[PDB]
């Protein structure tokens, strides 16, 4: 009883309909979760020293032919036309990132250049294969590309791996299985490029004490991949993360920089995504938590409620203070029994229920109950606000005990 | 200068390519401005009680055919096909918002329902008419649709008008022309509906003490509208804001709610955008400010710089303090003359240059230079940080004096 489709309906997070197969409509509360997940990713982009960009939604087929995506992916790409030119709605963000890199002369002092995007991508998947948020047609990839020198590969691949485990640990995912996918039958780049790339990814895994198995022939057409699979609380495997080494795309798109030796050089490209897609990861989280999202992700974090209208002015004031502390809060001043109110907000998976009777109004206190049924007692309002702020800002998995 | 296309190149904000006509490649610094503009709009969504949602990029042509917009605008829509079905890449967000409205039984108690989206839209505009950020194919509107009763229209229009002036004032736009477009020759609804609807728009304007003029017969087939034209510092007119009444779309897309008398009732829709295209608005702002973006919008708010090698670690400490204070800060530790650093960052329109010589280090102070060439002298570090935070939080047009 943790279906993301059911929870998504019950908590008014999102919906899907037949007029847009495999594409999500995010309702207010679901979009709040999505945006908080974006805020989290951005905090990591800042920490790990990434730029953030935005590329065009479509680009001319001629460009996708040049990069190799047309030859490999044409049947799974959406196309559209204008003025006798054909455009592919983008399946990937990498070519756009190279286009941005190519604006303005680059040198070795600009490298490593780490370029991230919340990339809106589309895949023309067979419609019968779509399911929930887990297999979709339109998605938002937490993508980035690192442009670096050959000598910087080791440190930059190492940083990507650190970033992967760091981010998964935030959500409580500690059981991770790793595969290394090597040269596929249909590919671009020379065998010596592939020897180098496969070797570098293998060394990274050895050095980080990450056990792995090879997945022979399952690499991307443009480079080998480290694939990260996390396991949820039901012990189900979800492949989410990927780190790839690419010596082909930057050459094909005429990317270059001036090295230390003043010689014109082609940058190496590292591709990576960690969550995989915002939509699928939200799906996974919804099931992992069964809708009991950690406080930092919860659509509504606190509900403050009165017993009678005698405490209404105090509740409104307290609601305002919580909102000023950055907390997603609402007041429940209805003329309903306290057990009726508490149940409604517990059903809605609100982390904290703040109750104000006469005794609380008199003492400048608030009675705190958690959605798990724990009565924390009557506590000083400022102590409660501070404790909630820390729980939220630290992105704690745990509520107050 | 005040050419946003030249400034856009100079400050590394964005670029365009023929591979994606009229679709912007946002570089890090331009995307920072875009993201800050979103944050600003979201603060107003909160203040004016809007939900925020997100819809997919495409929906079945079959659904678009039902809206009453198909015959009018089929030539300007991008289409793409899959499995014998044709999809439209959305040029507007209204039908998607109605799809969200149509999920779950709605009651009169849910009205007015205010639904905003930063809606990623595409129009197949002729390539010859494209121009920088102002005339594009891919654009993002600060869009919203309000679903309400007939009796609620005036108050809801009143709030939209307040929102327009509130938002324009933030950017220094106080000269605003207002036009009310009245019933066209070809229209839906009775004459009485139009009498009431035109009167609601006029009364809402009167209630905000706003003089206006008519654009006779220029209303849409589905209702009258108000349009807001702001004037920049060169006295150039930019039509940006729209409040559009719509008595057609809800019925066309089977939208309804349970009235207080238990009757199935069709809501009225209000379409509204304040900035309009955010790409275009960024273009307007770029020219308005001549690239001197107010500090809250500036891609890089502060550069901290040393005179000689001796102050490098003080610069690092101060940069970290600014980082921790939420300021977009960079350290310039190059072995270059201080005047060279000031010239470069002045040219890049960085609001503040925080200069650290021995005297500053020794006193725990910093010397503050503005991009206007103003020497503000030696100031206490914590005081400067507090003043910068206040300038940013208040979204002030004015730098410290
Ligand atoms: C991490 C990113 O930078 C990287 N480009 C990426 O997407 O890699 C994901 C794993 C390797 C690549 C695996 N794959 C393969 N065929 C595809 C065809 C289409 Br059409 C689309 Cl939309 C996506 C893919 C895809 O993802
Ligand atoms: C404010 C928004 O909700 C509103 N829908 C909107 O876009 O308003 C902007 C101004 C008036 C919008 C009026 N118009 C203008 N150009 C269009 C181009 C295409 Br292609 C299509 Cl399908 C429809 C329209 C359209 O209806
Ligand atoms: Zn990639
Ligand atoms: Zn609309």
């Amino acid at each position: 009883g943790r279906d993301h489709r059911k929870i998504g309906k019950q908590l008014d997070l999102y919906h899907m309909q037949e007029e847009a197969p495999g594409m999500v409509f995010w309702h207010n509360d679901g979009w709040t979760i999505f945006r908080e997940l974006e805020v989290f990713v951005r905090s990591k982009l800042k920490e790990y020293q990434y730029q953030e960009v935005k590329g065009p939604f479509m680009m001319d087929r001629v460009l996708w032919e040049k990069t190799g995506h047309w030859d490999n992916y044409k049947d799974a790409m959406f196309t559209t036309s204008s003025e006798n030119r054909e455009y592919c709605i983008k399946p990937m963000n990498c070519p756009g990132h190279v286009q941005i890199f190519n604006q303005g002369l680059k040198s070795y002092r600009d490298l490593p250049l780490r370029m991230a995007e919340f990339g809106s991508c589309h895949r023309n998947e067979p419609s019968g294969a779509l399911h929930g948020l887990m297999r979709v047609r339109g998605f938002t990839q937490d993508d980035a590309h690192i442009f670096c020198t050959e000598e910087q590969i080791r440190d930059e691949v190492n940083a990507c791996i650190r970033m992967v485990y760091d981010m998964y640990s935030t959500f409580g995912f500690e059981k991770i299985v790793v595969k290394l996918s090597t040269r596929p039958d249909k590919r671009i780049g020379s065998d010596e490029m592939w020897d180098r790339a496969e070797a570098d990814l293998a060394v990274a895994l050895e050095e980080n004490n990450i056990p792995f198995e090879y997945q022979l022939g399952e690499g991307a057409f443009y480079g080998p991949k480290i694939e990260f699979t996390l396991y949820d609380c039901l012990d189900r495997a979800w492949q989410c993360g990927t780190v790839q080494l690419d010596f082909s795309l930057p050459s094909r798109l005429s990317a270059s920089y001036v090295g230390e030796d003043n010689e014109r050089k082609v940058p190496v490209m590292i591709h990576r995504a960690i969550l995989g897609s915002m939509e699928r990861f939200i799906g996974i989280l919804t099931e992992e938590f069964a809708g009991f999202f950690p406080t930092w992700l919860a659509p509504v974090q606190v509900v403050v409620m009165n017993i009678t209208d005698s405490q209404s002015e105090y509740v409104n004031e307290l609601t305002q203070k919580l909102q000023n502390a950055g907390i997603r809060v609402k007041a429940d001043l209805r003329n309903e029994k306290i057990g009726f109110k508490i149940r409604e907000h517990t059903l809605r998976r609100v982390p904290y229920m703040l109750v104000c009777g006469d005794k609380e109004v008199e003492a400048g206190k608030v009675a705190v109950r958690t959605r798990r049924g724990k009565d924390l007692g009557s506590l000083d309002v400022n102590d409660v606000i501070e404790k909630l702020q820390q729980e939220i800002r630290s992105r704690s998995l745990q509520q107050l005990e």
Side-chain angles (χ1 to χ4, degrees), chain A residues 1-104 106-191 193-260 262 264-373 375-401:
Chain A
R2 63 178 70 243
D3 184 9
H4 69 279
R5 304 168 188 79
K6 182 64 172 181
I7 294 159
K9 185 162 197 295
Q10 288 176 311
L11 305 182
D12 201 28
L13 304 182
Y14 79 95
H15 88 274
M16 298 172 65
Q17 61 185 262
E18 289 296 292
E19 290 83 3
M23 293 171 196
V24 182
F25 295 80
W26 295 96
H27 298 197
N28 184 257
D29 286 3
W31 191 236
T32 294
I33 297 171
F34 193 120
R35 288 186 293 110
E36 285 318 301
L37 193 60
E38 285 190 339
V39 171
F40 167 73
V41 172
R42 288 189 171 115
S43 77
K44 296 286 163 188
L45 298 178
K46 186 169 186 65
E47 179 182 350
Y48 288 70
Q49 304 188 53
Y50 286 75
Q51 295 177 198
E52 189 190 335
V53 301
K54 194 72 162 178
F57 184 71
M58 72 186 72
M59 292 201 278
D60 198 310
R61 168 175 161 179
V62 171
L63 187 67
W64 300 103
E65 289 171 333
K66 186 185 284 169
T67 55
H69 295 258
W70 185 258
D71 190 56
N72 289 272
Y73 298 170
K74 62 181 94 74
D75 297 330
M77 284 192 284
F78 287 97
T79 56
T80 188
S81 54
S82 166
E83 300 179 7
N84 302 112
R85 287 217 274 153
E86 189 169 17
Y87 296 87
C88 303
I89 296 173
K90 67 176 162 70
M92 288 187 172
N93 312 294
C94 350
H97 292 184
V98 181
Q99 299 315 286
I100 294 171
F101 183 91
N102 286 169
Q103 294 297 123
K106 297 290 184 288
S107 78
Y108 73 93
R109 294 105 96 179
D110 302 307
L111 309 182
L113 192 157
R114 314 187 189 78
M115 190 184 292
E117 179 177 359
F118 296 97
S120 299
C121 292
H122 288 80
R123 189 163 187 174
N124 189 11
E125 295 269 19
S127 59
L130 301 170
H131 58 275
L133 297 175
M134 305 310 184
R135 184 144 173 168
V136 297
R137 279 188 168 177
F139 60 96
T140 310
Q141 191 174 41
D142 65 314
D143 200 11
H145 300 87
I146 300 97
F147 298 85
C148 70
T149 71
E150 278 80 6
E151 289 70 32
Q152 292 160 351
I153 289 167
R154 191 78 73 250
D155 200 62
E156 292 299 309
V157 173
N158 195 77
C160 281
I161 292 165
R162 290 190 291 95
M163 202 171 192
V164 169
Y165 286 91
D166 187 3
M167 289 168 55
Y168 294 162
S169 288
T170 295
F171 308 93
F173 297 128
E174 293 296 324
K175 178 176 172 179
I176 308 299
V177 172
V178 184
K179 298 288 201 286
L180 180 43
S181 294
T182 60
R183 65 197 73 191
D185 297 345
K186 187 177 179 166
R187 64 179 180 270
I188 61 169
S190 75
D191 283 19
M193 265 172 252
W194 279 90
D195 285 355
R196 181 105 172 76
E198 288 170 9
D200 283 335
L201 297 182
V203 170
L205 294 178
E206 315 308 330
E207 287 189 345
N208 285 278
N209 301 129
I210 295 170
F212 70 98
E213 289 173 14
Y214 281 103
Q215 282 186 328
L216 296 175
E218 297 304 319
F221 76 84
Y222 54 83
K225 327 183 288 185
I226 301 170
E227 299 272 88
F228 296 90
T229 298
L230 64 85
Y231 285 74
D232 67 16
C233 66
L234 301 183
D235 211 24
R236 297 180 296 183
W238 302 100
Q239 190 272 317
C240 289
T242 188
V243 173
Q244 311 160 0
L245 203 36
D246 182 354
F247 292 101
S248 295
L249 184 67
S251 182
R252 283 171 169 251
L253 296 176
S254 310
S256 75
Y257 69 98
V258 184
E260 265 198 314
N262 271 252
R264 187 149 295 285
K265 291 269 282 289
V266 181
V268 178
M269 278 180 83
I270 297 157
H271 302 240
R272 104 289 177 281
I274 302 179
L275 307 186
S277 80
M278 303 298 281
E279 294 80 1
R280 181 159 176 275
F281 202 77
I282 287 159
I284 294 163
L285 293 182
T286 300
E287 306 221 354
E288 175 64 12
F289 302 125
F292 291 76
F293 293 97
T295 305
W296 71 275
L297 283 167
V300 175
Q301 290 166 323
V302 178
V303 175
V304 187
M305 65 210 91
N306 61 353
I307 304 301
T308 64
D309 57 18
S310 184
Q311 311 92 29
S312 289
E313 289 80 24
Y314 186 84
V315 164
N316 286 330
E317 188 184 12
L318 180 52
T319 302
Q320 186 52 52
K321 289 186 186 186
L322 287 154
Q323 187 157 284
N324 293 346
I327 298 168
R328 293 192 287 283
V329 63
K330 63 180 185 161
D332 182 355
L333 305 178
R334 290 177 297 168
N335 208 309
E336 300 282 2
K337 293 182 182 184
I338 190 58
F340 183 95
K341 286 190 187 179
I342 292 285
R343 176 52 196 168
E344 291 205 332
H345 306 125
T346 300
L347 178 62
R348 300 291 298 182
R349 314 313 191 201
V350 175
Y352 292 101
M353 284 151 284
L354 267 56
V355 184
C356 297
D358 291 341
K359 171 168 48 57
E360 282 71 44
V361 175
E362 168 271 319
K365 288 192 176 164
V366 62
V368 181
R369 184 192 177 79
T370 74
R371 63 188 164 188
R372 301 291 191 178
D375 184 0
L376 301 185
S378 286
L379 306 168
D380 173 69
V381 163
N382 288 359
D383 290 346
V384 172
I385 294 175
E386 288 163 14
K387 286 164 190 297
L388 291 174
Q389 280 185 304
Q390 180 163 341
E391 186 179 330
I392 290 164
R393 290 178 184 195
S394 71
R395 297 193 178 85
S396 184
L397 286 165
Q398 304 177 139
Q399 288 188 257
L400 305 181
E401 305 297 336

